[PDB]
Amino acid sequence: LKFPTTKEIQEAVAAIADKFNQENDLVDRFFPEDSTFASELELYLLRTMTFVHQTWSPLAFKESRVWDEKEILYLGRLADEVQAGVINEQIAESLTWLMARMRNRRRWLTWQVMRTGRITIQPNDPYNPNGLKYVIDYGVTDIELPLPQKFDAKDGNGNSAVDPIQYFRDLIKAATYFPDRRPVAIIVGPGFDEVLADNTFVQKYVEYEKGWVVGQNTVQPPREVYRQAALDIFKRYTGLEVMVYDKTYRDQDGSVKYWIPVGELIVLNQSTGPVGRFVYTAHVAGQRNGKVVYATGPYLTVKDHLQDDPPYYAIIAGFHGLPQLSGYNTEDFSFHRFKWLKYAN
Amino acid sequence: KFPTTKEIQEAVAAIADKFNQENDLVDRFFPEDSTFASELELYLLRTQDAEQTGMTFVHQVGSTSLPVEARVAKVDLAKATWSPLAFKESRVWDEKEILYLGRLADEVQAGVINEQIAESLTWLMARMRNRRRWLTWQVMRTGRITIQPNDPYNPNGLKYVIDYGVTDIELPLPQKFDAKDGNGNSAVDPIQYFRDLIKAATYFPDRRPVAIIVGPGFDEVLADNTFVQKYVEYEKGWVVGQNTVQPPREVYRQAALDIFKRYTGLEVMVYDKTYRDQDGSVKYWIPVGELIVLNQSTGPVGRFVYTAHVAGQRNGKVVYATGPYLTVKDHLQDDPPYYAIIAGFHGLPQLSGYNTEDFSFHRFKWLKYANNV
Amino acid sequence: ASELELYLLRTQDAEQTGMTFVHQVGSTSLPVEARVAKVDLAKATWSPLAFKESRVWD
Numbered sequence: 001l002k003f004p005t006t007k008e009i010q011e012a013v014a015a016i017a018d019k020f021n022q023e024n025d026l027v028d029r030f031f032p033e034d035s036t037f038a039s040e041l042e043l044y045l046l047r048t049m050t051f052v053h054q055t056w057s058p059l060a061f062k063e064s065r066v067w068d069e070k071e072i073l074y075l076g077r078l079a080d081e082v083q084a085g086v087i088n089e090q091i092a093e094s095l096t097w098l099m100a101r102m103r104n105r106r107r108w109l110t111w112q113v114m115r116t117g118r119i120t121i122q123p124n125d126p127y128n129p130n131g132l133k134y135v136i137d138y139g140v141t142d143i144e145l146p147l148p149q150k151f152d153a154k155d156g157n158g159n160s161a162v163d164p165i166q167y168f169r170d171l172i173k174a175a176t177y178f179p180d181r182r183p184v185a186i187i188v189g190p191g192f193d194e195v196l197a198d199n200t201f202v203q204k205y206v207e208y209e210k211g212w213v214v215g216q217n218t219v220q221p222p223r224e225v226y227r228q229a230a231l232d233i234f235k236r237y238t239g240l241e242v243m244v245y246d247k248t249y250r251d252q253d254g255s256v257k258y259w260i261p262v263g264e265l266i267v268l269n270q271s272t273g274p275v276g277r278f279v280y281t282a283h284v285a286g287q288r289n290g291k292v293v294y295a296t297g298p299y300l301t302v303k304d305h306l307q308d309d310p311p312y313y314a315i316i317a318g319f320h321g322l323p324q325l326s327g328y329n330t331e332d333f334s335f336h337r338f339k340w341l342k343y344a345n
Numbered sequence: 346k347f348p349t350t351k352e353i354q355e356a357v358a359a360i361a362d363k364f365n366q367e368n369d370l371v372d373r374f375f376p377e378d379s380t381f382a383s384e385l386e387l388y389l390l391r392t393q394d395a396e397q398t399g400m401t402f403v404h405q406v407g408s409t410s411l412p413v414e415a416r417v418a419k420v421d422l423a424k425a426t427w428s429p430l431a432f433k434e435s436r437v438w439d440e441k442e443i444l445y446l447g448r449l450a451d452e453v454q455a456g457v458i459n460e461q462i463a464e465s466l467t468w469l470m471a472r473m474r475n476r477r478r479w480l481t482w483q484v485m486r487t488g489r490i491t492i493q494p495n496d497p498y499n500p501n502g503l504k505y506v507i508d509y510g511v512t513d514i515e516l517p518l519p520q521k522f523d524a525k526d527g528n529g530n531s532a533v534d535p536i537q538y539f540r541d542l543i544k545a546a547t548y549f550p551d552r553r554p555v556a557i558i559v560g561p562g563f564d565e566v567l568a569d570n571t572f573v574q575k576y577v578e579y580e581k582g583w584v585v586g587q588n589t590v591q592p593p594r595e596v597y598r599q600a601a602l603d604i605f606k607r608y609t610g611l612e613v614m615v616y617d618k619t620y621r622d623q624d625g626s627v628k629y630w631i632p633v634g635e636l637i638v639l640n641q642s643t644g645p646v647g648r649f650v651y652t653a654h655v656a657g658q659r660n661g662k663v664v665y666a667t668g669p670y671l672t673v674k675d676h677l678q679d680d681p682p683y684y685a686i687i688a689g690f691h692g693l694p695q696l697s698g699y700n701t702e703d704f705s706f707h708r709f710k711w712l713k714y715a716n717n718v
Numbered sequence: 719a720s721e722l723e724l725y726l727l728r729t730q731d732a733e734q735t736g737m738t739f740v741h742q743v744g745s746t747s748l749p750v751e752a753r754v755a756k757v758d759l760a761k762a763t764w765s766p767l768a769f770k771e772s773r774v775w776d
Contacts, residue, residue: 057758287346433739498740
């Protein structure tokens with residue numbers, strides 16, 4: 001008996017989405033969920049006095065994985081009486097892998113639109129069959145930061161060239177007049193402290209406080225300490241937050257890709273909280289027996305091909321999406337909120 | 346969220362009526378006809394004239410009649426090897442614009458979709474008509490039909506070389522018209538050239554150039570011909586030695602086609618029309634320079650034939666449609682997101698009645714001289 | 719609708735004829751190109767303006 005329950009499918013989709021939103025994350029909180037009824041091909045948006053009296057198209061994606069329906073009716077005709085409970089487990093595992101690659105897709109869109117700014121897709125991706133390309137602009141003043149010189153440059157026994165404490169101090173001085181240019185929080189998912197451990201300017205400044213001079217009392221400040229002390233040291237010196245968030249990536253390559261770039265950093269300066277938006281847009285569904293309706297959540301339903309002489313059993317959680325950038329300024333058209341320097345040589 | 350089907354058929358008939366209200370040369374030459382057959386006989390046959398005259402017999406009294414030589418239908422016994430090339434097409438719409446118009450036309454879903462319906466129907470009718478024009482003009486300008494994937498309606502390469510055995514589809518020009526000699530003069534009087542064609546056709550019934558077709562301007566080539574220049578000089582009574590010194594080029598251009606049509610007696614017709622095949626360069630069916638003559642008559646040559654409609658037949662014994670059709674395809678439920686309509690035809694234009702006497706048949710020929718632009 | 723649809727893009731001409739799609743009958747289908755009309759184009763850039771004006775006499 002291949003009978004699956006539809007309200008129970010909605011409840012299991014609710015449980016799977018509860019598990020998906022259970023694993024919460026920073027980049028999810030930057031570009032959050034939103035569901036409108038009108039797309040109108042509007043992606044790059046603009047958003048930013050109680051008087052005393054007397055440019056894109058919507059980029060969409062849906063998911064469906066096929067299985068062997070002959071294997072399915074094989075097992076469902078063999079295990080006859082406990083068919084429903086045995087098959088609902090496979091329904092659960094199917095919805096698990098479904099929601100897994102779906103959340104990987106949405107979160108993929110978010111970290112791709114952050115660390116690179118733009119979104120262009122290729123036919124060469126094995127994630128998708130066809131891969132027809134579509135490009136989306138950015139609208140930011142500076143997509144990335146300038147550098148005087150790189151950070152993993154060595155001189156002597158162990159020393160890094162430029163001090164990011166002194167450089168962000170100079171940014172504090174230059175942004176005292178304009179507090180929108182002062183970096184509020186820095187974002188680093190994978191490892192970033194091997195260069196701050198190289199800074200014997202900074203290790204020397206720490207042992208100035210600690211009173212063991214590198215030539216007088218101690219011999220060599222061990223960089224393995226500074227690999228997990230440099231966060232507290234850099235925060236004590238400059239005075240901004242450090243947040244560490246990193247995930248895996250399921251693709252044909254199998255290489256676990258961090259979503260923050262390895263090495264350098266990610267910087268916000270203007271504000272704190274959600275930058276931009278993910279926009280759920282409308283799903284095409286059944287028109288109706290009556291009249292039209294647009295889906296307001298990622299719609300999910302089942303497909304049986306028992307009736308069809310070419311058989312294939314699958315399921316689809318069909319919906320359509322849209323990425324939204326940050327609310328642009330009403331003073332200039334380029335709107336800077338995120339930036340990042342680059343020393344990944 | 347869809348218009349009516351009989352209203353869509355009436356609207357497509359209205360668009361076809363607006364299309365056919367605009368006539369054409371090539372619509373006059375090859376009017377439509379329909380067959381349930383598909384054998385695609387490459388030639389019709391009709392030949393019985395005074396150039397096929399014959400006469401009765403000198404027979405004596407009281408003897409047996411000397412009978413008729415029956416060479417006509419005996420030589421007419423042959424079989425044709427050709428196959429119809431059916432031309433069918435179907436637009437489609439992305440589901441994004443379907444939902445876009447379902448949202449944007451929440452107040453009036455009828456008209457804002459019916460305008461797109463009329464646009465798609467009329468543009469598809471125009472593409473069909475220009476495909477038929479391509480077929481007819483392409484066979485009339487070369488004698489044969491050839492296909493390759495280089496031509497941008499053919500991504501596939503489904504190529505079918507169809508020839509019709511016209512004897513000399515083209516005409517020898519020893520050189521072009523406007524070959525410059527002396528300082529600069531003409532190589533050949535075109536009118537004296539056409540009267541040489543008549544002079545060769547003094548004994549021949551179907552070599553005598555009756556009417557002529559040309560797409561673009563060749564009149565500047567006429568003005569470069571010092572023969573036509575001297576004709577216009579004698580026409581207005583001017584003398585380049587004595588009366589005038591230099592008339593313009595544009596007196597010559599103005600008087601050239603007039604003096605040509607008056608002296609040669611063949612009707613010059615101009616039917617340059619328009620096609621680009623996704624290349625931007627909208628071209629004329631006849632290229633520049635070279636021109637197509639007719640030497641049999643002026644009248645209908647050939648026949649456009651509708652090949653029978655292949656379709657989902659019915660429950661029982663079948664019958665096919667007899668002209669261009671239309672049907673819609675709704676995929677609002679299906680997994681690939683689209684909507685589509687389809688309206689094709691199955692057909693082929695056929696040539697005229699061949700001569701039943703011999704295999705030779707040539708109502709039209711063409712000569713090439715476009716050596717400089 | 720005040721569509722702000724400034725530049726109309728309607729190549730509805732006999733100049734843009736193309737041809738019908740040559741296809742082998744009996745074989746599997748191949749539709750005609752709807753991208754010859756349009757595939758993907760951005761939004762229209764206009765500020766759709768307005769005329770309103772009022773007469774007056776004392």
